[PDB]
């Protein structure tokens, strides 16, 4: 998609594993924000939003956590709690034409910047003096897309670059997507570390005998101590116990 | 499936004038940028005129210069070249190409050819 | 002409290896790497052995390799089989232009 009409995906109901992106094109950029990429594959998040346009490479860089710029505010914006990574690649070969590729625009002219990831696909005129522009462009007045051009005379800054920003938004429900794992047998009334849809302690499980209601999936003591999980295999109520501990 | 089709070959007369059609068909002919090729008896493959996908610019080959006029025609998926004051050296075998399998600026699809000759 | 300078004929036996150069100026091989090779019989369409100094396209065996050095490139065949006897050409994408090279006849005695 244009950057300035960006596609946005939801991606749910499925398996995260990212061996396939690794056998993908040479990454002109990984940078990733709040999260180890190497650790993607053990990642149950609940939603993740795939944003996806094409940009030049000289314009990369204004895509990040509170970045400015004529994408950064009229096209495209990141919120400063950007919890995900993007990926970007040189898509010269494709996307860059003959005698530029022109089916390609973005946003020149906006009155305010964009809230964070928000959409702006008008085009009416813009008023850069102070005659009011009546559905007419012109003198200080303009059309407010820009096409970009793409041609093979450009520099690699200058060259097609597709991008995907992948955004993964936390919760405290069901990981509809999770991680390329397995599961093991239950165990209980012993010491165990544990590994349920993601979280990761130590302690004797035990048969639960409270009620839970159900649309609940965690339990919760007083403060936050999880008490009690629901199985996301056996759909069954554990109670969680931290085991013996104590001073000598 | 995906085709290019060259016509409009012929006898002519030295300083005469020739229009040349290539014929697409299984894709977006306005997609894609467009160039005649031609191959003279004897003689190697010389670009003579390329076209971008919109037709808005053309590009031709400084031995066929002024004489040779490239044109398309996007609704009907129809590639053009017109030659006047055709002169001996023109009489070859004509290919129009695109590069619609690999980059704009590739020669990845070819027609048949058309035969051009120049009395 | 204009194209890229070729050898004029290269011979080979079966199942050896033969390398095919292809010299040309700084505005189309030594500018940038838009370099193709091609095979081509008369009377038929060519095919693209190589395209892009050194890459294949596809169903292009890994026997035919190229690269380029400055103002020249290089093409070389591996494994040479009786019906990679043909014409070939080297092509320069420069931008304003494209242009061929000179052909090399490879035969296959």
């Known amino acids: 998609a244009s950057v300035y009409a960006w596609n946005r995906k939801r991606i749910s109901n499925c398996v995260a594993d990212y061996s396939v992106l690794y056998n993908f094109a040479p990454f002109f950029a990984f940078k990733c924000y709040g999260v180890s990429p190497t650790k993607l594959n053990d990642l149950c998040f609940t939603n993740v939003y795939a944003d996806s346009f094409v940009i030049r490479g000289n314009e990369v860089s204004q895509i990040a956590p509170g970045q400015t710029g004529n994408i950064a505010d009229y096209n495209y914006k990141l919120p400063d709690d950007f919890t995900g990574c993007v990926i970007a690649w040189n898509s010269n070969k494709l996307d860059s034409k003959v005698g530029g590729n022109y089916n390609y625009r973005y946003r020149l002219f906006r009155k305010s910047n964009l809230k964070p990831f928000e959409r702006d696909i008008s085009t009416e005129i813009y008023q850069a003096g102070n005659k009011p522009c009546n559905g007419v462009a012109g003198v200080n007045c303009y059309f407010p897309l820009q096409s970009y051009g793409f041609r093979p005379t450009y520099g690699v800054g200058h060259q097609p670059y597709r991008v995907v920003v992948l955004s993964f938004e936390l919760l405290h429900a069901p990981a509809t997507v999770c991680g390329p794992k397995k599961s093991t047998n239950l165990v209980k009334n012993k010491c165990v570390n544990f590994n349920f849809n993601g979280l990761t302690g130590t302690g004797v499980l035990t048969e639960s005998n409270k009620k839970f209601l159900p649309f609940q999936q965690f339990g919760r003591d007083i403060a936050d101590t999880t008490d009690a999980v629901r199985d996301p295999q056996t759909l069954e109520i554990l109670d969680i116990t931290p085991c013996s501990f104590g001073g000598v | 499936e995906v085709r290019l089709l060259e016509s409009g070959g012929g006898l002519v007369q030295p300083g005469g004038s020739l229009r040349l059609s290539c014929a697409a068909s299984?894709?977006?002919?306005?997609?894609?940028?467009m160039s005649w090729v031609r191959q003279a008896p004897g003689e190697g493959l010389e670009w003579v005129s390329t076209?971008?996908?919109?037709?808005?610019?053309?590009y031709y080959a400084d031995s066929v210069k002024g004489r040779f006029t490239i044109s398309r025609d996007n609704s009907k998926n129809m590639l053009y070249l017109q030659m006047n004051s055709l002169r001996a050296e023109d009489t070859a075998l004509y290919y129009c190409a695109n590069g619609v399998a690999t980059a704009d600026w590739y020669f990845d699809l070819w027609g048949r050819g058309t035969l051009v000759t120049v009395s | 002409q204009s194209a890229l300078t070729q050898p004029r004929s290269v011979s080979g036996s079966p199942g050896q290896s033969v390398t095919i150069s292809c010299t040309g100026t700084?505005?189309?091989?030594?500018?940038?790497?838009?370099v193709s090779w091609f095979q081509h019989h008369p009377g038929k369409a060519p095919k693209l052995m190589i395209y892009?100094?050194?890459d294949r396209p596809s169903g292009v065996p890994d026997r035919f390799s190229g690269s380029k050095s400055g103002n020249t490139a290089s093409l070389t065949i591996s494994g040479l089989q009786a019906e990679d006897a043909a014409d070939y050409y080297c092509?320069?994408?420069?931008?304003?232009?494209?242009?061929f090279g000179g052909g090399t006849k490879l035969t296959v005695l």
């Open positions: 076209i971008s996908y919109s037709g808005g610019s053309t």
């Open positions: 092509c320069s994408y420069a931008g304003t232009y494209t242009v």
């Open positions: 892009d100094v050194t």
């Open positions: 299984g894709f977006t002919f306005n997609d894609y940028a």
């Open positions: 700084s505005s189309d091989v030594g500018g940038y790497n838009y």
